[PDB]
Structure 1
């Protein structure tokens, strides 16, 4: 296991780390959210850039990043543009997606970026290399908002992210049955027991999948997402309740 340490937070040891997502459509909204969010207790701040409407302007995006970092100078900050293809709010070109991510890396304002595995292997690998050259870690991600692949498929997908240089592979899948929630936990455990080179983040979405957001410590998900006021994906619960549960499990 190669853990990932950002600002004295160690991802891949101990209790799963709590991530919340900041979703602001504009600069004033981001400012207000950053001020509210700094009164919540959590480990990593994810900025969901795809909710930001002025995405065409790299400098507008960087100005918003700076608002966030100034509000919270000591928080690990993950920059995530979630494409609509994978359940986010809007669509941009692959070239603009890579530009925004490289700009984020160059800014020194963010500690981690999210790169979607299915952006394409060559582009992902080159951007991973860029991030690493600039001391930024990569959460490499995949989402299936329709269904849950087989456990074997999910393991192979996470392994491929590892092969491409991901610091932290991530997969989120939509259950169509309670059995699908167990499949996701099965794949998670298989990584912990047999492919434990990198911390992984896994979740089964929606109400049915909520237990996957709580059981990270036993089956091997290194982080989990909670909601401050609004969920950034189906199934997230209130961040304070998430924290209560994690602590009870850790101390059981």
Structure 2
């Protein structure tokens, strides 16, 4: 039930810490990667939707290459978060496909984030393309407005598994403390009944912070930190304390 990338075992032990690059251009991305040398985390995510020149596949690959070469030994996750799912800018489905395929077949990334709701033909084709090139798929879904029912969330995570996700991922926005418990309930129901691979879940915002800390208990394999948001050192501290309790 694990996914191993560059000696990192996702899906056992303590949840793994993901930090994200958000620079606009090559120099900005270089400066972030340099600053991140002083940090301790497990997975580097490039948030491509924060990059300015996403129109050129060449520009995107050149930046991916800079990042790959800046941190050659870190698991590298390529993520274009669509505006549709809370990201920073819009993209056509075809161009989203082009960028993901190019990242996959370039050898520059270990994992890609693929949004479940992209469309079935495109999701299946891109999953197959990733796997054929030895790239893992974090298949993702986000609701930045509200929290669906536990039943609906569990079905989405199960659907991601059925479609070949290596790591299903869901992130939802609480509108109450109750909604945080609903997210934890859905996570646990995956953990103990349907999951046969690692899953990542989160309740967003201040209210949902506990979901970023309690992954080892309820069944989320990774968590996002910052070099609602939580500093990576504080995150590490809590994860270790929980792991050794």
Name the TM-score class by shorter chain: over 0.9
- Indicate if the aligned counterparts of 2:20 and 2:44 stay in contact, CA closer than 8 A: yes
Q: How far 1:100 sits from its partner (Å)?
A: 0.1
- Whether contact under 8 Å (1:171, 1:203) holds in the other structure is yes
Contact 2:225 2:232 in 1 (8 A): yes
Q: 1:51-76: per-residue Cα shift (whole Å, max 9, x none)?
A: 00000011111111111111111000
Deviations 1:4-37 (A, max 9, x none): 0000101001100000011001111001001111
Structure 1 residue 221 displacement after superposition: 0.1
Contact 2:199–2:220, Cα closer than 8 Å, also in 1? yes
SS of the equivalent of 1:141 reads: strand
CA deviation after TM superposition for structure 1 residue 208, in Å: 0.2
Superposed structure 1 runs of 4+ greater than 6 Å apart: none
**In structure 2, what is the Cα distance between the partners aligned to 1:146 and 1:21?**
22
Shift of residue 145, structure 1, vs aligned partner: 0.4
Tell me if structure 2 keeps the 8 A contact 1:200–1:221.
yes
SS in 1 for 2:148: coil
Q: Distance in 2 between matches of 1:81 and 1:37?
A: 20
CA distance in 2, matches of 1:12, 1:212: 16
Q: Tell me if the contact between 1:54 and 1:60 (Cα under 8 Å) persists in the aligned partners.
A: yes
What CA deviation, in whole Å up to 9, does each residue of 1:146-198 have, x standing for no partner? Answer: 00000010000000000100000000000000000000000000000101211
- Give me the whole-angstrom Cα distance separating, in 2, the residues matched to 1:11 and 1:125: 23
Tell me how far apart the structure 2 counterparts of residues 67 and 174 of structure 1 sit (CA, whole Å): 33
The answer as to whether partners of 2:76 and 2:111 remain within 8 angstroms in 1 is yes
TM-score normalised by the chain length of structure 1: 0.96
What secondary structure is seen at the aligned counterpart in 1 of 2:49? helix
Measure how far apart 1:38 and its partner are.
Answer: 2.2
CA distance in 2 between partners of 1:236 and 1:190 (Å): 25
* RMSD (CA atoms): 0.6
- Give yes or no for contact 2:53–2:60 (8 Å, CA) kept in 1: yes
8 Å CA contact 2:158, 2:195 repeated in 1: no
Contact kept in structure 2, 1:78 and 1:111, CA below 8 Å: yes
Q: Equivalents in 2 of 1:109, 1:38: separation in Å? A: 19
Deviation at 1:104, TM superposition (A): 0.3
Residues 38 and 71 in structure 1, CA contact (< 8 A), matched pair in contact too = no
Q: Secondary structure at the match of 1:34?
A: helix
- The answer as to whether partners of 1:44 and 1:78 remain within 8 angstroms in 2 is yes
The residue aligned with 1:239 is 232
Q: Give me the whole-angstrom Cα distance separating, in 1, the residues matched to 2:91 and 2:179.
A: 31
Structure 1 regions of 5+ residues with no counterpart? 229-234
Q: In the alignment, what sits opposite 2:173? A: 174
Alpha-carbon displacement from aligned partner over 1:54-113 (angstroms, at most 9, x marks no partner): 000111111111111111110000000000111000001000000000000011110000
What is the rounded CA distance, in whole Å, between the counterparts of 1:121 and 1:169 in structure 2? 15
In structure 2, how many angstroms separate the alpha carbons of the residues matched to 1:193 and 1:224? 19
Between the aligned partners of 1:89 and 1:100, the Cα distance in structure 2 is 16
Instruction: Write the distance in 1 (CA, Å) between the matches of 2:97 and 2:167.
Output: 19
